[PDB]
Amino acid sequence: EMPQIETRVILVQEAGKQEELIKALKDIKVGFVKMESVEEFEGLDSPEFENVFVVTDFQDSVFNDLYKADCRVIGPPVVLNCSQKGEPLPFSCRPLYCTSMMNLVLCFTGFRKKEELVRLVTLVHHMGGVIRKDFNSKVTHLVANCTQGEKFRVAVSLGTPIMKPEWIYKAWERRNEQDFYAAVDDFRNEFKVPPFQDCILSFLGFSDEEKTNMEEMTEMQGGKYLPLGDERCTHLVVEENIVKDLPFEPSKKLYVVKQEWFWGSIQMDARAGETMYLYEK
């Protein structure tokens, strides 16, 4: 314990009414008080306690209120969960609604709009994950991301989960779910980046059955495919064998891979490092 004083929960507005809650505070020997108005705030400064305010929903008005006062805020879920798992109040620099994303470490690549980033960044925080400027080992459960990228490239080579922004929002929706944690395999799965995102493909040296099976798969691994030779292709795959050589010519930034890169990427469940399959001879 670093604050040298007994902790006390304030139940803010309609939180006061929520029942299972009180029973939980009582359940974990923590004293509460209630508060309906932001004027009542003044008389809550008490030498006897450090105050933790429970808010029912960020953001009621009262939320950006308490924030502005720099005080310690939390969501109902954080509490019940302490009574359920027989815990003590957790601490963090920031408001904490629940605990879905305790204690992952996230990282972002390919975001061009500030507003949205922040929104994500807040949500994680509430949940409450942390973020890292720089991609390293400590990065948990997560690169939140849009497909081309230098840390994406890395994250691939490490086998650390790459996630769609939707992961977060769809996780924040389950904020009031009891034993819900957002790194669980299945939920992670629904929301990872599909091996072929922002990918458009074409095939060479293949059976109209083999091929038309691949096409089927590509659209299914989140990719899109196009009739050969289009300029809007990202990569193009070959039978490195059967093709002793080639019919068309590419653009600089189009890819010319070997058969394996395709299944590699799928057995991997993540886009794969192209440099390794680049075509020669």
UniProtKB/Swiss-Prot annotation:
Residues 96-185, 191-279 form the BRCT domain. Expressed in lung epithelial cells (at protein level). Expressed in squamous cell carcinoma, primary non-small cell lung cancer tumors and lung adenocarcinoma. Induction: Up-regulated by calcium in cells forming cell-cell contact sites. Up-regulated by DNA damaging agents like H(2)O(2) or ionizing radiation (IR). Phosphorylated by PLK1 in vitro. Hyperphosphorylated during the G2 phase of the cell cycle. Dephosphorylated at the time of cytokinesis. Disulfide bonds: none annotated. It is found in: Nucleus; Cytoplasm; Cytoplasm, Cytoskeleton, Spindle; Cleavage furrow. The BRCT domains 1 and 2 are required for intramolecular interaction, but not for intermolecular oligomerization. The BRCT domains negatively inhibit its GEF activity in interphase cells. The same BRCT domains may act as a positive regulatory motif for the completion of cytokinesis after the breakdown of nuclear membrane during mitosis. Guanine nucleotide exchange factor (GEF) that catalyzes the exchange of GDP for GTP. Promotes guanine nucleotide exchange on the Rho family members of small GTPases, like RHOA, RHOC, RAC1 and CDC42. Required for signal transduction pathways involved in the regulation of cytokinesis. Component of the centralspindlin complex that serves as a microtubule-dependent and Rho-mediated signaling required for the myosin contractile ring formation during the cell cycle cytokinesis. Regulates the translocation of RHOA from the central spindle to the equatorial region. Homodimer. Homooligomer. Found in the centralspindlin complex. Interacts with NR1I3. Interacts with PKP4; the interaction is observed at the midbody. This is Protein ECT2. It comes from Homo sapiens. The gene is ECT2. The chain holds residues 45 to 356 of 914 of the full protein.
